[PDB]
Amino acid sequence: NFDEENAYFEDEEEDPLEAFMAEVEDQAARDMKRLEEKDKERKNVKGIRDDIEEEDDQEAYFRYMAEN
């Protein structure tokens, strides 16, 4: 956020959008209600992160040392 130009500029100080916001609010409220209800969720796994779900080489080495 630093620039001698940014400081210079930031120093001199003294209907359709509403419709879009209303539609977004209705959609967001419906999604929030569905998540709170947790009544109809099949938990469809989107994308599996292999690194997050699989032990690293260093972790495997630590496990081996602990075992023997």
Partner: protein
Amino acid sequence: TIHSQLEHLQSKYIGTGHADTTKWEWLVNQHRDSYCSYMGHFDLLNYFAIAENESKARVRFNLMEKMLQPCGPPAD
């Protein structure tokens, strides 16, 4: 512990052995990397495709299909 890490990294590499390795594991390892070496080297595949009178794509697909269970299923 550097030697122990080397002993864990050598085990990690696929194709390495140890004092309990059997004949079957050794032989399937060398068959599998033989098939990969055939897929890699351009003039070995040429030799095989001329020998058995097939297209090179067919020989490649046959080798990939043989990759799954070379030397038959294991013991007991």
